[PDB]
Design a binder for this molecule. Structure first.
Ligand SMILES: Nc1ncnc2c1ncn2[C@@H]1O[C@H](COP(=O)(O)OP(=O)(O)OP(=O)(O)O)[C@@H](O)[C@H]1O
Ligand SMILES: Nc1ncnc2c1ncn2[C@@H]1O[C@H](COP(=O)(O)OP(=O)(O)OP(=O)(O)O)[C@@H](O)[C@H]1O
Lengths: 693, 693
C-alpha cells in the first residue's frame, strides 16, 4: 500500500470525510452546505478540540478519536498547526489531506518549511496532499465536494456532465461553474506540493465519467509527465482544451540567432503541446464554447460551416467575422441549391450564411424545414449551424419563431452524423425555452459569434489531430546543459556543420593576409564577397563587403575592415540572385528541437514572418510550410514575370534541417542559415551561425 | 407645416395614435400591450371596417370618423388597401404614417408602384412615412411605442436612458433591446421611402434626451446628407458609434493603380467617416460596451488604463489581451508606488493589472480601499477599472467579496473626473446585486475583457476626435466625372504631373529606334533602363530591363522586348539604392481624394502595408504616417549600419501628394508613384501611373 493507491480516491466516491479545524467561519460552513446540497451520501466528521458541537454535529477532539475509516481529511487550521494534522491523518491512513488555506511554500521561506514538514509526515503512509493554497475539488458524479466555494445556486444551478477541469487558479472556478458546462470533476491544484497537474490529468484520462478536459495553466512544473499525461488522454480519445496564461511575456534570455527573436518560448511550447493534441484557446469563454461543442459526440468530415440566420445584417456580420477567424463558409453544393431553388424559387440566390426570413409567402416553419433538410445533407458542409439571437425575456411571438429552427435541428439530429450548433450572434443569455429544446436533443448551444467560430475552428483542428494518428515524439532533454549562457561557435565549425548536413555552401575559402585574398579572389572571378570573422552579426559593424568588382575594390574594402581585429577572413562567390529565406533550429530547454523557417536576409526580424515545425519533418509538411508564407510562396511560383525557383530543393533542405536538429539539439542549441538563398536551381547557404551551451 | 414640422414628432411626445386595420392578431395586440406597458398617456384609436369593437373598445370604420386630432397612424392593412389609408391619413393631416408590413418597394415592381402611390398621397399634406417594411420606432422618454415587437419584459424591463439607435436592420433591434443599454429612441429605417437614416440622425443630433448614438449601417444612401448629420452630431458633442456591414466584401471595381487593391472602398469610407467622428466597432456586443462607457459623463486625460483584480490568472490573461487590442497598462506613478509601499509594503512591487487578493493579512476591505483610493489619483492612469468575475448565482460569500471593490469605486466616484469601469473577464451575466451598486453610482459595467478593452480604446479615440477640433472637409463630387469606364493615361502625361507637382524623376529620355537609344544611353552613361511604354504593369510582361551595363547588353534587352509592340521606349538612369515606397492618391466616387502611402516596389500588394490620409495632410500627420510602418521607419533611421535616409523629403513628398490630390481629384482619379525611392538625400519617383474618365 502507498501513495499510488491513495491517489485513485480523487476520482472516486469517498465514504467518509473529516473536517479538521471545523468552526463557525466560511470554509466549514460552505463545506457542510455543499455536502448537504450536493447530496453527499457518505459520513461527515467534524474535528476541533475547541468546540463540543456545531450545527448539532459532534465535534471530535482529534482525528484519533473517530471510530471509523477516514478517506479524506480537509484541514482548515493554521499552517503551524497543520503539521500535526498531517501526522495524525497519516497515523490513521487517510488517503488524502486537502489543504485549501494559503501561507505555505508560496508565501515564503517559513511556509515552504511547513509545507515540507507536511509532505514528510504524509510520506510515512503515502497520504496524498492536495494543494496547499487551493479551493479543493469536486466530483459531481460521486456527489462529493471537498470544495471551498459556494456550489449551491438556486438561481443558476451547476449541471452535471462530461466536462472536467484542472485549474492552477483558485479564482476562476466559479467562472467555469457559472457557465452552461455540464461538469464532472474540477480540481484546483494550488501549490502542487504533492499532487501536480499531470497527476490530475492522468486521472481524468482514464475516468469514464469525463469525455472532455479543460486545463487552465499558469505553469507546467513537470514537463515530461505532463506530456505523457497528454498522450494518455489521446490514447483514450479525450479532447484536451487549454488556456495558457503569460502568452505575451517577453522571455529575456540569450540568443545569437535571429531564430531566438522569431520563435518565442510561448509559441514553441504551443507548437509542441498541439503536437500532443492540445486545443489552445485564449480565455474562459472560448474554453467553454469549445467544450460545449465537443460535449456532443459528432465530428465533421470536412472543414466547412453552414449558417442559417433570420437577419441579413447579422448574416453579414457573421460572414465578416468568419474571415477574421479563418472559418470557411463556402457556397452550398450544386445539389443543395437546386434542391432549394426548386421548392423555394422565391429565395433566389443562396448565400452562406443564409437568411431565410421574410423571403417567402410560405409559413416560416416550412421554409426552415426545407432549407435545413437540404443543407443537412449537403456533402460540402461539415458543420450545420443556426445563427439566431433568441435573448432571455423575449416575447412569446419571438419565441415562436426563434424556436422553429431549433425544433428543426432536433428533428434532423437522429439522422445525421454532422455536428449541429445553434448559436446567438450576441453574448447575452439565451431564452431558456429555446435552450431546453436543443438540450433535449443533444444539440450544442453557444452564445456569441466569435465563440461559435472558435468552437468550429477547434472541432476541425481536433479532427485533423485524430487523422494524424502519428503524434509528436517526446525528446529527452537529459543531456542538455543547464548553463544559461551561450557560446558562439567558430565560423570554421559552422561551415563543418553545413557540410556534414549536406547544405550547399558558395565556393569560398578562408584567407590569412591581403595578397592571399587577392590571389584567391583573382582565381575565382568577380564579384566576390569579403566578410570579417568571429562575429555573430558582421553587417552591423561593417563586416560584409558585397558586389566587389576588381581587385581594386577588394583591397579597399579590406582596408576599411581592419579596425575589426579579424583573425581570419572569408571570401566567397557573389551568389547572384535568389529569394532569401531563413532556415534554422533551436533547442528548447523543456521540449527539444524546433525548426524555424521563413522570410530571411538582413531584414529577417523586421519581416517577422516564420513557421515552426517539430522534427522529423515529412516532405509533405515542408511543402505546406513553404506554401504557408504568401510572399515566399508566390515568389517560388515566380512572381510577376520572374523565374520559378527550386521548390523541391527548398523542401529537401527544410527536411534536412529537421534531421540535423534531431541529431545535434542536445549539444548545439542554435543552428541558423540566414540567408538560405533559393534559386532557379538548388538552394545556397550564404551564411551560417551556431551556438552552444 | 409640410415635411419639416411633421418629421419632428418622431422625436417628441405624440398625444394620439390611430391603428388602421386593428384586429385580434399579433401586430395590433403587441402595439396595444407596448403602449399599455410603456405607460403611454395619450389616446389610442382603433380603425377597421370589419369590427364594431375589439375587446369591447370601439372600433371606428374609418380614419375619417375619429373626432380628434390624429398625430401618428400605424397602417396594418395589406399594401393595396394602404393607398386608401394614406389618402385618409393625409386628409386629416396626420404627421406620420408608420408602415411595418412588407410587400412594398422591396417586394417587386408592383410593390414599388403601391409605394410611390403612397408617397404620392402623403405629399399632399406633407405627411411623413416611416418604412415601409420595418418594426416602427420607440421613444422611451415620451413613452411612445409604435413598435411591432414585444417590449414588455416584466422581469427585465427596457430601462430608460441616454442612448439612441438607428438600424437599417429590423432583426437587430431586439438584440439591442435585450442588452443592458439605457435606451432613449430606437428607429428602424425599413425601405427609407420617405424618412432616411440621415433624417433620423439629424433628429438625434439635437435631441436633448439623446447623448450617445449607435448606428447599424447596411448602406448609406445619401452621402452628403449623412456626412452633414454626422457634423451636426459633432457640433452638439454627441458621440456616434457604428457597425458597418460588408467589411470583407471584395469590390474589384475601378483600379489601374495598385492603390485600388491596397485601399478598398470599405477602408476608404471608414477613414472618411472617422474623420467626421464615427467610432466604428465590429459587432453588437462591442457597440453596447462602447455606449455603456460613453453613457457616463467622464472622459480620460491620458490614454492609459489601470485594472485591479482578485485573480492572478485573469490578471495575466487581461494583460495578454491588452497587447492584442493595443491598450496601455503602464506601471503606476512613483507617487502611487511610494504611497502604497508606505501603507501595504507586504504587497511588494505593484504590477498593472494589480491582483489585490491574498497578498495581505489586512482585511480585503482595507486593502481594496487603500489601493483604489491611491490609484484613482494616479496622474499616469487615464481610466480606472476593476476587473472581477462576479457571475449571476454566486454565493453570499462571493458577493460579499466581489462587491467590495464595487462599493469602493462607488465611494470614490464623487471626487474624481476619471472614467470608472467595473468589468468581468467572462462574457456571462453579472450578479445583479453587484451590478446595482455600480448602476446607482453612475459607474460603467461591462461583460467580457475584449468588450472592456474595445470600449476603453473607443474612449481614447473619441477624446482624440474632440481634441483636434479641425475635422475632415467635405469634398464635392459634383463635377466628378460620372462615367464608370477607367481610361489609363499615357506615360507622356504621367511624367508631366510629376514635374508640375514637383517630384523629380531619374535622368530619362524617350526614344523610338534602338540607335537613338544606344546614342542617348552612351550620352548619360551606364547602367540604365529599359522600359516599354503604354503598357500595364510593364514588369509583368518583361517590360523592364534594369542594370544594363553596355550598348551591347542594351540591344540584347531591347530585342527581348520586341514582341510587346511598344510605340515608345523610356530610357532612364539606373537609380542606385534607397528604400522603395509607394505614394499615391485616388478619387473616391463619394468622398473625394484620399492619399495612400506605404511599402512600395514590385511586391507592393504582397507587403499590403499602407496608411491612408485625407488631404490636406499636415507636416506632422505625414511624420506619423512614416513612423507607423516599422519596416519603412527603421530603415529611414538607418537599419543595422545602413545610413539614415531623408525623412524631411519623404515627409514633404506626402504633403505634396495631398496637395496634388486636393487640386486634381475631380479629373485625375488615380495618381500613383511606385516606387518612390527614399534616398540619403532627397526622394525620386522611379515610375508613374495615372487614370481619368
Ligand atoms: N556570398 C554572398 N553572395 C551574395 N550576397 C551575400 C553573400 N553573402 C552575404 N550576402 C548578403 O549579405 C547579407 C548579409 O550577410 P551575412 O548574413 O553573412 O552577414 P550577417 O551580418 O552575419 O547577417 P545576419 O546575421 O543578419 O544573418 C545577406 O543577407 C546577403 O544579402
Ligand atoms: N530608374 C530605375 N532605377 C533603379 N531601379 C528601377 C528603376 N526603374 C524601375 N526600377 C525597378 O524596377 C521595378 C519596376 O519598375 P516599374 O515600377 O517602372 O515597372 P512596373 O511593372 O510598372 O511596376 P509596378 O506596376 O509595380 O508599378 C521597380 O520597382 C524598381 O525596383
Amino acid at each position: 500500500a502507498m501513495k499510488k493507491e491513495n491517489l485513485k480516491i480523487l476520482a472516486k466516491k469517498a465514504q467518509t470525510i473529516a473536517i479538521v479545524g471545523a468552526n463557525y467561519r466560511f470554509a466549514t460552513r460552505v463545506l457542510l452546505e455543499n455536502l448537504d446540497k450536493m447530496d453527499f451520501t457518505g459520513t461527515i466528521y467534524l474535528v476541533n478540540p475547541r468546540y463540543e458541537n456545531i450545527d448539532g454535529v459532534r465535534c471530535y477532539q482529534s482525528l484519533l478519536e473517530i471510530e471509523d475509516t477516514i478517506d479524506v481529511v480537509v484541514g482548515l487550521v493554521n499552517p503551524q498547526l497543520m503539521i500535526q494534522v498531517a501526522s495524525n491523518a497519516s497515523k490513521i491512513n487517510a488517503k488524502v489531506l486537502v489543504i485549501p488555506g494559503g501561507g505555505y511554500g508560496e508565501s515564503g521561506v517559513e511556509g515552504q518549511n511547513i509545507q515540507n514538514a507536511i509532505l514528510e509526515r504524509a510520506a510515512d503512509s503515502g497520504m496524498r496532499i492536495v494543494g496547499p493554497n487551493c479551493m479543493g475539488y469536486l466530483n459531481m458524479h460521486a456527489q462529493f465536494t471537498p470544495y471551498i466555494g459556494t456550489l449551491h445556486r438556486p438561481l443558476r444551478p451547476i449541471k452535471k456532465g462530461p466536462v472536467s477541469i484542472i485549474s492552477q487558479s483558485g479564482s476562476v472556478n466559479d467562472a467555469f461553474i457559472a457557465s452552461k458546462l455540464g461538469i464532472s470533476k474540477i480540481y484546483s491544484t494550488g501549490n502542487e506540493a504533492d499532487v501536480q497537474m499531470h497527476d490530475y490529468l492522468n486521472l481524468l484520462a482514464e475516468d469514464p465519467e469525463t469525455s472532455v478536459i479543460i486545463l487552465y495553466i499558469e505553469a507546467i512544473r513537470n514537463h515530461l509527465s505532463f506530456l505523457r499525461a497528454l498522450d494518455l488522454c489521446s490514447k483514450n480519445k479525450k479532447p484536451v482544451i487549454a488556456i495558457k496564461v503569460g502568452r505575451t511575456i517577453k522571455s529575456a534570455a540569450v540568443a545569437n540567432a535571429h531564430s531566438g527573436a522569431l520563435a518565442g518560448d510561448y509559441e514553441i511550447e504551443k507548437l509542441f503541446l498541439e503536437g500532443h493534441g492540445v486545443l489552445f484557446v485564449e480565455d474562459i469563454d472560448q474554453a467553454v464554447a469549445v467544450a460545449l461543442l465537443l460535449s456532443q459526440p459528432y465530428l465533421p468530415t470536412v472543414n466547412t460551416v453552414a449558417a442559417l440566420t433570420v437577419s441579413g445584417g447579422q448574416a453579414g456580420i457573421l460572414l465578416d467575422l468568419a474571415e477574421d477567424y479563418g472559418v470557411d463558409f463556402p457556397d452550398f453544393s450544386a445539389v443543395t441549391n437546386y434542391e432549394i431553388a426548386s421548392k423555394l424559387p422565391e429565395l433566389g440566390g443562396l448565400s452562406n450564411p443564409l437568411d431565410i426570413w421574410g423571403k417567402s409567402s410560405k409559413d416560416f416553419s416550412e421554409v426552415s424545414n426545407i432549407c435545413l433538410s437540404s443543407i443537412v445533407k449537403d456533402a460540402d458542409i461539415g458543420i450545420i449551424t443556426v445563427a439566431i439571437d433568441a435573448p432571455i425575456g423575449q416575447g412569446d411571438h419571438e419565441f415562436d419563431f426563434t424556436s422553429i429552427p431549433a425544433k428543426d435541428l432536433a428533428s434532423l439530429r437522429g439522422n445525421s452524423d454532422k455536428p449541429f450548433l445553434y448559436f446567438s450572434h450576441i453574448q447575452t443569455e439565451f431564452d431558456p425555452r429555446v435552450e431546453s429544446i436543443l438540450d433535449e436533443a443533444g444539440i450544442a448551444v453557444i452564445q456569441g459569434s466569435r465563440n461559435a467560430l472558435v468552437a468550429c475552428r477547434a472541432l476541425f483542428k481536433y479532427k485533423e489531430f485524430l487523422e494524424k494518428n502519428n503524434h509528436t515524439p517526446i525528446y529527452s532533454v537529459e543531456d542538455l546543459s543547464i548553463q544559461k549562457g551561450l557560446k558562439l561557435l567558430h565560423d570554421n565549425e559552422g561551415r563543418k556543420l553545413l557540410d556534414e548536413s549536406g547544405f550547399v555552401s558558395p565556393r569560398e575559402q578562408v584567407v590569412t593576409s591581403l595578397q592571399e585574398g587577392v590571389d584567391y579572389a583573382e582565381s575565382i572571378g568577380y564579384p566576390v564577397v569579403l566578410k570579417a570573422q568571429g562575429l555573430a552579426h558582421k553587417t552591423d559593424v561593417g563586416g560584409v563587403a558585397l558586389n566587389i568588382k576588381s581587385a581594386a575594390k577588394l583591397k579597399k574594402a579590406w582596408g576599411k575592415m581592419e579596425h575589426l581585429n579579424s583573425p581570419y577572413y572569408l571570401i566567397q562567390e557573389m551568389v547572384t540572385d535568389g529569394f532569401e529565406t531563413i532556415l534554422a533550429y533551436r533547442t528548447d530547454m523543456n521540449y527539444g528541437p524546433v525548426v524555424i523557417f521563413g522570410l530571411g536576409g538582413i531584414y529577417t526580424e523586421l519581416f517577422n514572418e516564420v513557421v515552426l515545425a517539430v522534427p522529423p519533418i515529412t516532405h509533405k509538411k515542408a511543402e505546406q510550410m513553404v506554401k504557408s508564407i504568401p510572399m515566399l510562396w508566390k515568389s517560388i511560383e515566380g512572381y510577376r514575370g520572374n523565374p520559378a525557383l527550386d521548390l523541391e530543393a527548398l523542401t529537401a533542405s527544410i527536411v534536412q534541417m529537421g534531421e540535423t536538429a534531431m541529431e545535434k539539439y542536445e549539444e548545439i542549441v542554435e543552428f541558423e542559415i540566414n540567408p538560405l538563398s533559393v534559386r532557379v536551381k538548388g538552394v545556397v547557404a550564404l551564411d551560417v551561425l551556431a551556438s552552444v551551451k
